[PDB]
Design a protein around this ligand. Structure first.
Ligand SMILES: Cc1ncc(COP(=O)(O)O)c(C/N=C2\CC(C(=O)O)=C[C@H]2C(=O)O)c1O
Ligand SMILES: Cc1ncc(COP(=O)(O)O)c(C/N=C2\CC(C(=O)O)=C[C@H]2C(=O)O)c1O
Ligand code: FES
Lengths: 461, 462
């Protein structure tokens, strides 16, 4: 189930990784590779590289490994002769689903449906989840504006040549700092880093400011309240402005916590008010839980913290859920087939794994565990913040979804590199932030393992 | 390895499928579902449904199953205890690849690299393959324009808010009848059916006509070279037209054989001439082999029939290749990391399957078989086109990648329902066409078996 603690043999990346990285660099730009891994020996919270180093993984493959490496319940799943077909016979799910398709969804995604969302469509990643959510919303908004009336074949002629009115000028509203994926629709709503965006054609869609909170939160209540109201007002202005530009906002997309943009949090009150604005202006409210979903904030979906019976119209997911997809309200159900469609629509082998994952999360009480291990981790980070204010500021988090800021990008990268050499895998976000994305089997004792290591690092820094 | 004939028991969809379909229709529009399947009992070319029916599968999951259902070598893979980790520990490939990642690529995709393309990036589907091919092309074009100089301050600031100059107004040129995927970039180059495009915002990019060939090819040689020539002229006119409208064509995307648009073919000469038009105007030439790739035309990539040493700059693939991705020339390699990137970049579990799949295609010479069994197929249809000219016209194909047209939509659908009830599954492209997408273990006698069944269907048709 897990190892005792990290065990380091070489610097990271070590010689075998550098050689493998050299080989990979022949066929593609491999500059992003951190090191090469031995997934066969990785277990629980621990990632093992090809040089025999064993690191406590607080990054979890960009927050996509739900219950650790080589989990024995998932090993057993694959060993079962009845499951071999799921792995070698991949169906075109939208036309030829396998027999157990509904029953496996009942054991997995449907058992954690968000409140008010009866509909579910599966997708293979977070980008095509969000893209097909955009299209679902565009179709819903046009269906609002046309009744009753069928497809005018002026629309049917124009749409084949990328022309109005068949191809409308609707917009999706998004937030500075957002990250929603990399295909060209998602990218327009992404506003994280210049390197993600530069040289790519885009859409003229409204971009709103995301609240920047001041820490400690308990000393800045009035100012954080004012900041959020400012952002809410600008959101509303943009909807009216782009309505007058004939670029009508059909939906609003937001992350419950902005990840790649620098772990930007906002109050539950902000999101409830934003959901209200979306309803008021007839915009679909699209909540992207690709990164916050799967339980690390202490609830299965992070938007559950908002306390709403009607939290959103559409909610997209991926990563920890193994498969992508989106839940939505019944009124967004497409009237006709083949409008939301592609070859694979996910992968039933991922659903097979996800049903066992969800069963482990529920039986091992891992939502409550994440709330607890996260409080322990955050308490420790606040302690380190008080002891090393020249290095650590803006400690923040919900559940294990935690982060802090360092002085600059150069310092962030040195600390990550040292921590890796001391047996801890960390990830970055934003300009200068260090983020924590532990798997759901991260325990309070793993928090202490990290904090002790980081204490000695900051002492010697 | 295979059954030796269809085995029917009910109409299709049978009772259990209709029940499963009603259940599924509760949580999503299920109007597209044909029937539910028992893949555990499916074998080779035969798809078994939940009502016990066994049909000859000439659609192969929209042309995505490479070597038939439940192949014993793929079965033998999943049962190796060394491979368990591969299925349950999915990495973020761009940052933390597994130890065997490069070698498994050598065993698989790299051993079928097209001519002139040393670079490879993997992706999970055909849509993000083409999307990232587009972005690779846009980055390369801007790199030409800016030379070896850094991003400007104004570019870095305006790209964050969707504005020029950071976000250029480049275009990708595509063809009518093209299908390149459903995400919003892909969709703007797709021109297949109106039901794919309506109510979705798009890009003002150039759309060129694809040549509509008259058949028999024997009889219309000069009409067809004239048709192909004027299409080539409109392509060139659009590039010139969009450069002045400050929407410079950075690349051209085309399928070697259009699929979803109605199985539109064109001569090898046409693609060679289009290849040179692209180069001549400094456009990247992007060849979409998502559907044609994998060997069904008798060569692993369809474009291999063109006989070029420089067939393309970028080539995307998916479906039969299990994983997606794209090959490209070295000069298209991104200068900096994190520009072409996402969490998974495919899936090592698919690479593990593809390596065994590619070994079997070579060891058992399935490319020859596809050219051969495709000939028997196409020969048979031509005979049935002669004996029934009121139903079947324009019998075309390359390898097993064949199609034909019917008078109208209703006869198309009726023939498919009849044929499926008689034990053979066919797909349909366009408004009134019937296509053949057999797996690569489809053989001589599977041709004949379909031919004999469709024969009797033909003799009893109203
Ligand atoms: C809220 C959210 N929405 C959509 C997506 C898109 O999913 P896919 O990656 O499956 O297409 C993601 C994925 N997250 C990252 C991808 C990435 C990169 O540089 O591409 C850096 C990661 C990061 O979180 O910083 C995401 O977190
Ligand atoms: C030539 C072609 N290109 C892209 C796609 C889109 O693939 P996906 O359906 O996997 O997104 C398809 C199907 C297709 O035939
Ligand atoms: S776009 Fe989601 S897997 Fe290709």
């Amino acid at each position: 189930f897990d190892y005792d603690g990290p065990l380091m043999k070489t610097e990271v990346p070590g010689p075998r990784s550098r050689e493998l990285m050299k080989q990979l660099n022949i066929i593609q730009n491999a500059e992003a590779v951190h090191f090469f891994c031995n997934y066969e020996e990785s277990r629980g919270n621990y990632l093992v590289d090809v040089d025999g180093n064993r690191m406590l993984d607080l990054y979890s493959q960009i927050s996509s490994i739900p219950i650790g490496y080589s989990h024995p319940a998932l090993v057993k799943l694959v060993q079962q002769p009845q499951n071999v077909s799921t792995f070698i016979n991949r169906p075109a799910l939208g036309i030829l689903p396998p027999e157990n398709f509904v029953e496996k969804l009942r054991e997995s995604l449907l058992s954690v449906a968000p409140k008010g969302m009866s509909q579910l469509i599966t997708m293979a990643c977070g980008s095509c989840s969000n893209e097909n959510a955009f299209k679902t919303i565009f179709m819903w908004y046009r269906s609002k504006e046309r009744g009753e009336s069928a497809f005018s074949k002026e629309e049917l002629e124009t749409c084949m040549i990328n022309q109005a009115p068949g191809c409308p000028d609707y917009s999706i509203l998004s937030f500075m700092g957002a990250f929603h994926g990399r295909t060209m629709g998602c990218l327009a709503t992404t506003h994280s880093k210049a390197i993600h965006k530069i040289d790519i054609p885009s859409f003229d869609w409204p971009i709103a400011p995301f609240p920047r909170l001041k820490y400690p939160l308990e000393e800045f209540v009035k100012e954080n309240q004012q900041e959020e109201a400012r952002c809410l007002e600008e959101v509303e202005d943009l909807i009216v402005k782009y309505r007058k530009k004939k670029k009508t906002v059909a939906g609003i997309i937001v992350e419950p916590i902005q990840s790649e943009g620098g772990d930007n949090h906002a109050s539950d009150d902000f999101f409830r008010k934003l959901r209200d604005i979306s309803r008021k202006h007839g915009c679909a409210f699209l909540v992207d839980e690709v990164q916050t979903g799967g339980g690390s904030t202490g609830k299965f979906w992070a938007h559950e913290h908002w306390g709403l019976d009607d939290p959103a119209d559409v909610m997209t997911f991926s990563k920890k859920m193994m498969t992508g997809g989106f839940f939505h309200k019944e009124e967004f159900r497409p009237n006709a087939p083949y409008r939301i469609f592609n070859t694979w629509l996910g992968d039933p082998s991922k659903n097979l794994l996800l049903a066992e994952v969800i069963n482990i999360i529920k039986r091992e009480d891992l939502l409550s565990n994440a709330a607890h291990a996260g409080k322990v981790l955050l308490t420790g980070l606040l302690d380190l913040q008080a002891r090393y204010p020249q290095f650590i500021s803006r400690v923040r988090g919900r559940g294990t979804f935690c982060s802090f800021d360092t002085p600059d990008e150069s310092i962030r990268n040195k600390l990550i590199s040292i921590a890796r050499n001391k047996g801890v895998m960390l990830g970055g976000c934003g300009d200068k932030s260090i983020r924590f994305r532990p798997t759901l089997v991260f325990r309070d004792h793993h928090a202490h393992l990290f904090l002790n290591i980081f204490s000695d690092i900051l002492a010697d820094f």
